[PDB]
């Protein structure tokens, strides 16, 4: 019957701000005796997840005093205070009052700083994946922020569609930026057919788009 | 001093079994509760069930979407905790984790396991070196790497020039092509003029297929 809402799914802050995460039970869970058994977790990228409060408002062992949580019967809070790096990752709350148990949805924390443009690369195929009959082509945009941006991939100049995928790197633990790679796949006859294949792209930090280009010669 | 290890998980054909353990120590095991969470790639963590400690009869609960498929058992001499998982889905795809329920909480997790049920069969990976091609734009810093492509199933590690390589290094996370097979690119920053002089090497690890492969990235 219980149902857990987290919010907000997402939540950007800076550093040294102020993060706070609510969570919402349908349904009261506090105990007779007076114990109310809703904690919070934290799952950094990569490794697994960490207790972090107990008991609604208890500090786990190794929780430096910044984090804090809060809140009555049905509405519960954690609060971050003068963030930093490390405590980038996905918070948790959970309820443990009744069966069966339930995790909130969830809360990805990133840390917002100042925008960056991006370093961008081009990368040909290599004539060893030729003899294939696949040529994959690798658009390279390194360390920039935010993470939104947009890749067009043009072939003879002709705008290409479908046939791309992104992947973007986790928030760099140093500078807080991000990398994202491109990849246009064609068929190795559709690769030796054109001649100038071009990444071009736009970016908050870039005035006018930047584009990189080669050609198959 | 507390310490749970997982074991157990892999690649199993739908519909299949496979049996997850985890090995406790530094505790009293038959005094708590204990554990299992899954969490499938860019999910959420979900709650799957728990087993009770000795002042309960170690009785089980479970969560709607395992209960009558997954059961939860433990080797008390052994201090050894198991998840039985019997008619695998896909949608049981997931790194799984067990708890110590302790702090009135879960206060101490596995490592995680990794669980993949797939007809797909164990296929080793291609490696092309990703090299800046005759225009080289007359800046400072050139990059450079390797594709990992169509493997299956994940995951594949990368390395560069053994592990001596690491600053400026972006090995991004896998993607799942209009096929069924995942590939990668992993890629490093150096200097324009470092190119030719020197040699970049990109160390491809990929256990699931007991592949092992040495690219060099010549330009």
């Known amino acids: 019957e219980l149902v857990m809402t987290q919010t907000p799914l997402s939540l950007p802050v800076s550093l040294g701000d102020q993060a706070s995460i609510s969570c919402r039970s349908s349904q009261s869970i506090v105990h007779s005796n007076g114990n109310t058994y809703l904690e919070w977790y934290l799952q950094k990228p990569g490794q697994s997840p960490k207790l972090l409060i107990y008991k609604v408002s208890n500090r786990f062992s190794g929780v430096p005093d910044r984090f804090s949580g809060s809140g009555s019967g049905t509405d519960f809070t954690l609060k971050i205070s003068r963030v930093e790096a490390e405590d980038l990752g996905v918070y948790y709350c959970f309820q443990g009052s009744h069966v069966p148990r339930t995790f909130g949805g969830g809360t990805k924390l990133e840390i917002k700083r100042t925008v960056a443009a991006p370093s961008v690369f081009i990368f040909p195929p290599s004539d060893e994946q030729l003899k294939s009959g696949t040529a994959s082509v690798v658009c390279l945009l390194n360390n920039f922020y935010p993470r939104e941006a947009k890749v067009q991939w043009k072939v003879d100049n002709a705008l290409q569609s479908g046939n791309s995928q992104e992947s973007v790197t986790e928030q760099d633990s140093k500078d807080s930026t991000y990398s994202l790679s491109s990849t246009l796949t064609l068929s190795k006859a559709d690769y030796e057919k054109h001649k100038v294949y071009a990444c071009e792209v736009t970016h908050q930090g870039l005035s006018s788009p930047v584009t990189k280009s080669f050609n198959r010669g | 001093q507390v310490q749970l290890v997982e074991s157990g998980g892999g690649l199993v054909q739908p519909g299949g079994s496979l049996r997850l353990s985890c090995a406790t120590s530094g505790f009293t095991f038959t005094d708590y509760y204990m554990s299992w969470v899954r969490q499938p790639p860019g999910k959420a963590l979900e709650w799957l069930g728990f087993?009770?400690?000795?002042?309960?009869?170690?009785?089980?609960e479970y969560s709607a979407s395992v209960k009558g498929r997954f059961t939860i058992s433990r080797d008390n001499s052994q201090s050894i905790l198991y998840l039985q998982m019997n008619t695998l889905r896909a949608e049981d795809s997931a790194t799984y984790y067990c708890?110590?329920?302790?702090?009135?909480?879960?206060?101490?997790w596995g490592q995680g396991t990794s669980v993949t049920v797939s007809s797909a069969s164990t296929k080793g990976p291609s490696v092309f070196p990703l090299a800046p091609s005759s225009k080289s734009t007359s800046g400072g810093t050139a990059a450079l790497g390797c594709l990992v492509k169509d493997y299956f199933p994940e995951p594949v590690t990368v390395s560069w020039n053994s592990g001596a390589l690491t600053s400026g290094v972006h090995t991004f996370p896998a993607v799942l092509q209009s096929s069924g097979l995942y590939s990668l690119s992993s890629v490093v920053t150096v200097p324009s003029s470092s190119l030719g002089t020197q040699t970049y090497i990109c160390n491809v690890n990929h256990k699931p297929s007991n592949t092992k492969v040495d690219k060099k990235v010549e330009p």
């Open positions: 087993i009770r400690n000795k002042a309960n009869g170690y009785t089980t």
């Open positions: 708890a110590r329920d302790g702090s009135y909480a879960m206060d101490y």
